[PDB]
From a paper:
Aminoglycoside phosphotransferases, APHs, catalyze the transfer of a phosphate to a hydroxyl group of the antibiotic. APH(2″)-IVa confers a high level of resistance in several Enterococcus strains towards various aminoglycosides that are prescribed in clinics, and it can use either ATP or GTP as phospho-donor. APH(2″)-IVa is specific for 4,6-disubstituted aminoglycosides as phosphate acceptors. The main interactions are electrostatic bonds between the positively charged amino groups of aminoglycosides and Glu or Asp residues of APH.
We solved the structure at a resolution of 3.05 Å of APH(2″)-IVa in complex with G418 (geneticin), that has an intermediate affinity for APH(2″)-IVa. As already observed in the previous published structures, Glu235 stabilizes rings A and B of the aminoglycoside. Interestingly, the interaction between Glu238 and the ring A of aminoglycoside is maintained even if the substituent in the 6′-position of G418 is different. However, its interaction with ring B is, in turn, abolished. Similar to kanamycin A and tobramycin structures, ring C is maintained by an interaction with Asp197. In general, the APH(2″)-IVa ∙ G418 complex is characterized by less interactions than the binary complex with tobramycin, which may be at the origin of the weaker affinity of G418 compared to tobramycin. More importantly, the H-bond formed between Glu235 and 2′-OH of kanamycin A is replaced by a salt bridge with 2′-NH3+ of tobramycin or G418. However, the crystal structure of the APH(2″)-IVa ∙ G418 complex shows that the hydroxyl and methyl groups on the C6′ of G418 do not create novel interactions with the protein. The absence of a primary amine on C6′ of ring A seems to affect the binding affinity of aminoglycosides for APH. Indeed, G418 has a weaker affinity for the apoprotein than gentamicin, with a secondary amine at C6′, and even weaker than sisomicin with a primary amine.
Numbering used by the authors: 2 to 297
The structure:
């Protein structure tokens, strides 16, 4: 699915006739949504497909709830679409947040003082977010990790039966068995997490040299809080392990060794996710890649 500018303008003007669009342009494009910037004050997201539509819904449902409870700015919901055909939510419109993504490059050009400060600021955020009371959220927001794995294991065998020989397939089973036999990946206290906590979603003020917002809650869910630290650890694309080590100290984490153990798993696991996401997105280059990494 893709949208023209006209199409988009119709969608909004329709449910919101007493709201005129002056400037519209594309702020960016994701795997689930295209993001349009309207009047320079708003980000409107349009889903590119049914699953994206569902994430959008959650992002909306979630931001409403945690609106005005966190240390840093997050987006505010202002405009909502309608369910329709296969899409649960047509589109949505959030307030724009001034800022630049705090890319790892940027991060290391800041003086050590502003670096140590951002560490402390993120820790505070993650800390608050993970404290929010989960008793009100409906069950479907609880991501059960053990189910996800089992579900994945099955999708894989379908998709790989006609790609792999007995002795190759037995290595995947071995791998999944080892994950599922390990209690550490599952025995956590669930809480609300961002679940895509990367640099691309951390906004930064070039004047003040301080973090000035957080932004994509499309994947947010009730899950293992360690996931919000792991997403920052990959060395090439995200911040260091060394930087994330500081966040953890201000967050006063009790089991850092466990978190690293989870990272190593997720990193290996990502191979399999490329295959799954690759087939349904479908990026065939994701699918070819994962198939080669697996063979190890
Ligand atoms: C719902 N969509 C999400 C989507 O947001 C995205 O998340 C990325 C994630 O892929 C990246 O992380 C992943 O992808 C990168 C790859 C793109 O270079 C790999 O280097 C890395 O090992 C892997 N963990 C991470 N660096 C940023 C997140 N925002 O990819 C995963 C996803 C589940 O499809």
């Amino acid at each position: 699915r893709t949208y023209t500018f006209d199409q988009v303008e119709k969608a909004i003007e329709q449910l919101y006739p007493d709201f005129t669009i002056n400037t519209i342009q594309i702020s960016g494009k994701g795997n689930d949504c295209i993001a349009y910037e309207i009047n320079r004050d708003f980000i409107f997201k349009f889903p590119k497909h049914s699953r994206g539509s569902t994430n959008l819904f959650n992002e909306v449902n979630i931001l409403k709830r945690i609106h005005n409870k966190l240390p840093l700015p997050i987006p505010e919901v202002v405009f909502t679409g309608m369910p329709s055909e296969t899409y649960q939510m047509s589109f949505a419109g959030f307030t724009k947040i001034k800022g630049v993504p705090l890319t790892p490059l940027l991060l290391n050009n800041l003086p050590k003082q502003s670096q140590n400060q951002a560490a402390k600021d993120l820790a505070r955020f993650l800390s608050e977010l993970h404290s929010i009371n989960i008793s009100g959220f409906k069950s479907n927001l609880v991501l059960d990790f053990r189910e996800k794995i089992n579900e994945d294991n099955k999708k894989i065998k379908k998709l790989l039966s006609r790609e792999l020989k007995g002795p190759q397939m037995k290595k995947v089973d071995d791998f999944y068995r080892d994950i599922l036999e390990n209690e550490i990946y599952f025995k956590y206290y669930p809480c609300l997490i961002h679940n895509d906590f990367s640099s691309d979603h951390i906004l930064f003020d070039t004047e003040k040299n301080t973090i000035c917002g957080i932004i994509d809650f499309g994947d947010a869910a009730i899950s293992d809080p360690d996931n919000d630290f792991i997403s920052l650890m990959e060395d090439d694309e995200e911040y260091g392990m060394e930087f994330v080590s500081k966040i953890l100290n201000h967050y006063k984490h009790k089991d850092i060794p466990t978190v690293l153990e989870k990272y190593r798993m997720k990193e290996k696991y990502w191979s399999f996710e490329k295959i799954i996401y690759g087939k349904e997105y479908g990026y065939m280059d994701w699918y070819e890649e994962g198939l080669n990494e697996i063979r190890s």
